[PDB]
Symmetry: C2
Subunit: 249 residues, 2 copies
């Protein structure tokens, strides 16, 4: 008779465990916010995670720009994720053949699969990209997001491409938990939709993204603003996005 | 139809492409080694032993369990001595400040040692635009992924045409394509073809379908005698090339 809450979706029979965990945290903390940690140093990453952890459901990392990466830094981040209750999403945009991405996900110096709840992939190589990641991620109970649409000028992720991304997700629903897209690309409530939003400040508003287009999670930049202003902004943004979610219910 | 040496002297040739084409002619090689190993020692041994047989060494730095930047500085010394380009097969796909930092910074410092990198076109020209801000001052080049070798690849039809257009629009930085066949008729662009072995034979790829450089991994890397294998592939690819002049 109506739209499903995040909590209701977390109980669906075919829900992915990582999706369910995420949905329950969103419901509990009343947050739709995925914070982008686009920083170059471990101190910046950990301090941002500590300060803004309470306001977010997810922290999006790029470990390959972290100048002083170590696995110990990642362990500290995981502790913050557990203490403040958010998932870690490594925005690596895996985009190679299956045999290569398997090693890039499990191996090298980053050991991404050992700490990242979620990673994402481009679907251009075909389903082998998902298959390779799944080989590593499934035994570790990880999830994956597929990039189905993009807001950038000249994006080729439209039409049949977007439909192909959705088909891939369905073919690998033991591992793929959702999409990064500008709007809903599937009616199946087990899939999460993450969508870019306007950055924090002291068509991309939470009201349009979450309220009108029905995305689940808004991806927000940290803003070029003070820490005091950032903390205040994060809470105002969280409330606005949450209210938008409630309005659609 | 045009020789590599002649293409090296074209007016609109990119300096990196010219450098590559001249060493290809000097060494009679159009072979790119896919150095798919997880240990720094294995990477350097392959580069030393097989450097003389190849025009290019293709790396995945993010698969090395024991990466350090000193490893890549030693790789540069081998590249300079044995005369080959270093191609980091990173398949960049982000845009803006992120892709710039992924190319220049973090632990890998890719732009400091890779002559060539590659980029996807799916996000639009933002990937190339970001990379170019870093790479152009450093006299680097880029390859665009126009087709892929994998089952279910979506890099077909209009996608492939978009890649070619993007290359033409960024010819100050883009020197060619990863593709299964010739996709541009402009001789200033190089074509590199993945998954070559023994349709994926050197003679088909280079001899009939018009690609320039074969990328070979397992056929050399897992061979009982790697140097013998490398020369075998080099000779096959080079003869395929001469066959079409």
């Amino acid at each position: 008779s109506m739209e499903l809450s995040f909590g209701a979706r977390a109980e669906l029979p075919r829900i992915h465990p990582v999706a369910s965990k995420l949905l329950r945290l969103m419901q509990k903390k009343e947050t739709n916010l995925c914070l982008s940690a686009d920083v170059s140093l471990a101190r910046e990453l950990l301090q941002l995670a500590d300060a803004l952890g309470p306001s977010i459901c997810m922290l999006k990392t790029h470990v390959d720009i972290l100048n002083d990466f170590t696995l110990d830094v990642m362990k500290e981040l995981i502790t913050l994720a557990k203490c403040h209750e958010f998932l870690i999403f490594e925005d690596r945009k895996f985009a190679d053949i299956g045999n290569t991405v398997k090693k890039q996900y499990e191996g090298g110096i980053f050991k991404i699969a050992s700490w990242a709840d979620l990673v994402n992939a481009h679907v251009v190589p075909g389903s082998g990209v998902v298959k390779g990641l799944q080989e590593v991620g499934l035994p570790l109970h990880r999830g994956c997001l597929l990039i189905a649409e993009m807001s950038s000028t000249g994006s080729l992720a439209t039409g049949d491409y977007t439909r192909a991304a959705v088909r891939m997700a369905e073919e690998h629903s033991e591992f793929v938990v959702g999409f990064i897209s500008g709007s809903r690309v599937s009616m199946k409530p087990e899939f999460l939709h993450l969508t870019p939003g306007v950055q924090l400040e002291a068509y991309n508003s939470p009201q349009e993204v979450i309220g009108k287009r029905g995305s689940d999670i808004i991806i927000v930049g940290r803003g070029i603003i003070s820490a005091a202003d950032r903390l205040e902004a994060a809470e105002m943004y969280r409330k606005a996005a949450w209210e938008a979610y409630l309005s659609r219910l």
